[PDB]
């Protein structure tokens, strides 16, 4: 016999700041809600 386990997760502060920045292509909005793939959360390696 096998069963399923339901585990619900929470969000963070920068993600909710991004959700505030959205309403401030509809298919591109669905990808960020899972993981921030379009925007860059990293201060990425930039040569000065």
């Amino acid at each position: 016999k096998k069963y399923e386990h339901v585990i619900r997760c929470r969000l963070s502060k920068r993600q909710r700041c991004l959700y505030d920045d959205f309403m401030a292509i509809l298919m591109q909005l669905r990808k960020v809600c899972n993981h921030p793939n379009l925007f860059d959360p990293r201060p990425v390696t930039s040569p000065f």
Binding site: T45, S46, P47, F48
Partner: protein
């Protein structure tokens, strides 16, 4: 939450759209004339047309001119640079006396630079073949660089481990803000005293060549200068030429004492420690005198802001002890009274708690009487 911030009760200036200064707005309740004076100053900063003007602040010690400068700096935000400096910071031993006031006008002015650069994300192979998820391309590599991504501007190794997708050549637009004194230090220090012919001659011409066409963007800064009544007369001599210039940004001065003796001549007195040739070249701003109703109001606003709810009797005791000796003593009676309420277990602070704390700690006038 970082509780350490001293002057904290500030959201902005609180000026309305119709030009009227609202009293109960943005925390700083009071000083209507200073806000109506700085409403023209913030427009002078925002318009970015006229520059090289001095604004002197005067009044009793403890009128909140530092909170006013912080309110101006928070209205301007992170776009407009804000450089604070006191009068004792310009003095040094190995650094000459006429070097800090020279470099303040360069560290105040900022420049927005947008540059397009490339990144080669090649993996493994002087001929170095850069392998990607698209293909391999060979490049002629310099004999200087010998020892994942690299730095191609004018060499980060590894980056992966399997024994990194993307194209071979890329592009990206880096948008940064560089001050002119950072440009001067980078000129002096390749991969301190600035010589005049480079700092005034060539750097201004090459910044004009960057603005010259589309690229960058020049943003002036705000130089806050405190402790001017105890500054040397040679710094005043350089400041007279500093105000007589078209490339100098806006400088807000702050004076504390009423009358002083100028350090350097040690014989002549002067109001607010400033000679007549420099006091003619400033914009005099005068603060007002505190009332006990506004005193109790600002103590209540500071207490409600930080962490503390106070009943009416202890607020009356704080207002009386601020009317008698010191407002900042009434500021400092907040946290040990809260600690005594946490020790005794009270959720609020009564009259007995602030009475015992005022019995323990002493004043300045009370120490002068002893």
């Amino acid at each position: 939450t970082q509780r350490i911030a001293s002057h904290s009760h500030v959201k902005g200036l609180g000026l309305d759209e119709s030009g009227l200064a609202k009293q109960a707005a943005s925390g700083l309740v009071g000083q209507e004339n200073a806000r109506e004076a700085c409403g023209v100053i913030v427009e002078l900063i925002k318009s970015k047309k006229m520059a090289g003007r001095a604004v002197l602040l005067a009044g009793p010690p403890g009128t909140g001119k530092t909170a006013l400068a912080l309110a101006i700096a928070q209205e301007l935000g992170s776009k407009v640079p804000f450089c604070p400096m006191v009068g004792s910071e310009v003095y040094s031993t190995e650094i000459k006396k006429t070097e800090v006031l020279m470099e303040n006008f360069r560290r105040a002015i900022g420049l927005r630079i947008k540059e397009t650069k490339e990144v080669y994300e090649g993996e493994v192979t002087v001929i170095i073949g850069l392998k990607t998820a698209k293909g391999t391309k060979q490049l002629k590599l310099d004999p200087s660089i010998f020892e994942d991504v690299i730095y191609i501007e004018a060499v980060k190794r590894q980056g992966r481990c399997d024994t990194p997708k993307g194209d071979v050549h890329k592009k990206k637009e880096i948008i940064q803000d560089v001050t002119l004194h950072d440009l001067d230090v980078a000129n002096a220090r390749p991969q301190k005293t600035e010589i005049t012919d480079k700092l005034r001659g060539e750097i201004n011409k090459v910044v004009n060549k960057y603005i010259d066409q589309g690229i960058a963007e020049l943003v002036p800064g705000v130089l806050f200068v405190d402790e001017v009544h105890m500054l040397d007369i040679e710094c005043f001599t350089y400041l007279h030429r500093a105000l007589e210039s078209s490339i100098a940004p806006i400088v807000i001065f702050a004076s504390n004492r009423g009358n002083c003796v100028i350090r350097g001549t040690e014989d002549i007195t002067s109001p607010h420690g400033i000679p007549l040739d420099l006091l003619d070249r400033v914009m005099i701003i005068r603060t007002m005198l505190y009332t006990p109703q506004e005193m109790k109001q600002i103590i209540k606003i500071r207490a409600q802001t930080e962490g503390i709810n106070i009943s009416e009797e202890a607020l009356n005791h704080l207002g009386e002890i601020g009317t008698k000796t010191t407002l900042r003593y009434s500021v400092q009676l907040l946290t040990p009274a809260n600690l005594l309420a946490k020790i005794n277990g009270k959720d609020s602070i009564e009259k007995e708690h602030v009475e015992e704390i005022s019995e323990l700690f002493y004043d300045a006038k009370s120490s002068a009487k002893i």
